[PDB]
Amino acid sequence: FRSTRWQALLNFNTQRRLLLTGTPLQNNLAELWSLLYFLMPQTVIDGKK
DNA sequence: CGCCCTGGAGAATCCCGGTGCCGAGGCCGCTCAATTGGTCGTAGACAGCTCTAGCACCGCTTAAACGCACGTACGCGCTGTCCCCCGCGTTTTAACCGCCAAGGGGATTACTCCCTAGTCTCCAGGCACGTGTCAGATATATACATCCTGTGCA
């Protein structure tokens, strides 16, 4: 989430997003919630609830 | 046989939109030195008076400025040479980010004493000034010292 290319790709003009990945990690919910953030920005910052 | 003038080509530039991005300025919260007045004592302008070097000048007395004539030699124009850095393509490194997060010491702000010096005061003495005296530079007697002249001679 703290990387620069994170916010670099967020402001582009698109009506849809498609993520192609092999597999994410099981634990470390921060990166899972991060991919969920970059999917669409409807998610709050609370992953610990 | 080889050079100015023309034409084709190429690319570097100018200028006009076109959309994302961020700090200039506005707005507010706040807050502290400017403002107003009074007090107080103090140097600056106004004469006052004085005194002293600048001013304008006159006339010897050399001394640089100048006009010119000659001249010769280096600044300059021209020419041949050659070599060194620019233009460009290919190689090689510096720096940014991603990972993966922690502290660290030094200027800042606030508080806190404490003691060196401003201010006032009086006592003393020391260097700017007047005068004594020798050093150096100056102008003049002087005892010979070198031509000139009577002058006597062989």
Alpha-carbon distance A46 to A31, whole Å?
A: 13
CA dist A29 and A4 (Å) reads 20
Largest Cα–Cα distance in chain A?
32
Residue A42 CA distance to nucleotide B121 C1' (Å): 86
Determination technique for this entry:
cryo-EM
Length A22 CA → B91 C1' (Å) = 38
Cβ(A43)–Cβ(A33) below 8 Å:
yes
Contact A17, A11 (CB under 8 A): no
What is the nearest nucleotide to A1, using C1' and CA? Answer: B98
Give the SS3 label for residue A29.
helix
Look at residue A28 and give its three-state secondary structure.
coil
Half-sphere exposure of A36 (CA within 13 A, CB side): 11
Whole-number Å distance between alpha carbons of A14 and A2: 22
If residue A37 lies in a helix (H) or strand (E), which one and from where to where?
helix A29-39
User: Reported resolution in A?
Assistant: 3.6
Q: Is A12 left (phi over 0), alpha (psi -120 to 50) or beta?
A: beta
